[PDB]
């Protein structure tokens, strides 16, 4: 069966493509969802791509990915340097966790120390590169 | 076509020989071939070089700066320890992608941080040797 991958975007990402397109790119979150779904499907993956500004909703999704042993690509957005609850929930995942940021945040994520790996600064392509890693490192 | 420089620092010459259970069984020589194959596939040329010498790495980075070529850099044992390397990289006009095989944020970061991360285009850590191939894909799509 095709590998289910959850792609979770946190606060601010709802404004992707609308807010500061000269910094984070012109692609909207809707277009990002479609691009990720297409590329995942090409790789034999099923991407479940969601955005929320609610910490509670993000935790809720992470908990389901934990129980289901499904990989997660997480861009915590505005919660990246603030939510300990996200860190704590992600610590319970039993499949890979790839943290992704569009911009190079380094120019102290709670998530990075507990993620499998991290991709930052590579734009929206970072999500696609994370998919390609998972396609090669998680089996069906 | 585009020429990409992959530069590997100290320790990376022992890839596949040192702690293969941690960094993988693929040797640096085999990594070169994997990178070369992927660059052929993507329509890029890749030059892959490794040295344990900081001075040698600085020379290669200065040369990439003068040539205006992109750099994929795994500073290896110099990651947390060479300001000079960062200064050299600051003069690169083409993209700079930092790659680490291991997730450096998980293993040994208490005080110390990568010097390169703030000035890199982007960073890939923890994705194993595939991280190099992923960085190549980024470069192919971006010039
Ligand atoms: O929401 C954020 C920032 O709070 C975070 O520090 C970086 C971040 O996670 C990233 O580079 O992916 C993301 C950056 C960011 C924004 F900061 C923002 F305001 C947006 F509208 C947006 F689409 C966007 F991607
Ligand atoms: O929370 C859920 C599921 O319980 C529901 O069946 C679908 C659902 O509401 C949706 O497609 O938006 C959502 C699916 C879902 C998950 F099931 C999940 F494990 C995630 F990690 C996740 F990000 C995600 F979006
Ligand atoms: O040389 C290093 C470490 O000194 C560095 O902290 C991380 C590092 O840059 C990375 O994960 O890519 C690299 C890790 C590492 C090693 F630490 C090492 F001893 C090797 F033989 C090796 F091949 C290797 F990749
Ligand atoms: O918030 C805490 O201090 C804490 C204390 C005791 C615990 O058993 C515990 O799990 C936490 C919360 C916590 C994590 F869940 C976790 F995954 C961490 F990496 C962490 F540092 C942490 F501290
Ligand atoms: Cl890609
Ligand atoms: Cl790949
Ligand atoms: Na495609």
């Amino acid at each position: 069966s095709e590998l289910i991958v959850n792609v979770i975007n946190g606060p601010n990402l709802g404004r992707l493509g609308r807010r500061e397109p000269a910094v984070y790119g012109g692609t909207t979150h809707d277009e990002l969802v479609a691009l990720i779904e297409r590329e995942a499907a090409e790789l034999g993956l099923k991407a479940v791509v969601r955005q929320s500004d609610s910490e509670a909703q993000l935790l809720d999704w992470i908990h389901q990915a934990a129980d289901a042993a499904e990989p997660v690509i997480l861009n915590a957005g505005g919660l990246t340097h603030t939510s300990v609850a996200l860190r704590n929930a992600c610590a319970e995942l039993s499949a890979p966790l790839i943290e992704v940021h569009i911009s190079n945040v380094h120019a102290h994520s709670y998530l990075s120390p507990i993620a499998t790996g991290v991709i930052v600064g590579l734009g929206i392509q970072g999500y696609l590169l994370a998919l390609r890693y998972l396609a090669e490192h998680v089996g069906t």
Side-chain angles (χ1 to χ4, degrees), chain A residues 125 128-129 132:
Chain A
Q125 195 176 3
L128 309 182
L129 298 173
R132 289 182 179 281

Side-chain angles (χ1 to χ4, degrees), chain A residues 7-133:
Chain A
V7 182
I8 300 170
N9 284 322
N12 300 334
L13 275 289
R15 304 280 309 172
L16 187 65
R18 297 207 300 284
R19 171 160 170 195
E20 301 173 72
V23 179
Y24 309 109
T27 305
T28 62
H29 193 271
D30 276 356
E31 297 172 276
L32 177 66
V33 169
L35 177 58
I36 293 172
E37 289 170 346
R38 183 187 79 189
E39 295 299 311
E42 296 170 0
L43 297 163
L45 278 43
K46 185 206 166 47
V48 175
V49 190
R50 300 291 178 268
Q51 192 278 319
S52 179
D53 296 334
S54 164
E55 183 189 61
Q57 181 65 82
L58 306 171
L59 295 174
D60 164 21
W61 287 330
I62 294 163
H63 278 285
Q64 290 179 66
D67 282 353
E70 288 171 0
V72 171
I73 295 168
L74 181 55
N75 181 348
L79 291 177
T80 295
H81 311 292
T82 63
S83 175
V84 314
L86 197 50
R87 179 201 65 195
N88 296 348
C90 282
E92 307 181 357
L93 290 171
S94 68
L97 169 61
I98 317 304
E99 184 177 5
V100 170
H101 300 287
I102 292 169
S103 71
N104 185 353
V105 298
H106 303 297
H108 54 321
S109 167
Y110 284 107
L111 312 67
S112 306
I114 55 85
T116 304
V118 188
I119 302 175
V120 309
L122 302 185
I124 65 175
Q125 195 176 3
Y127 295 92
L128 309 182
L129 298 173
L131 291 170
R132 289 182 179 281
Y133 173 84

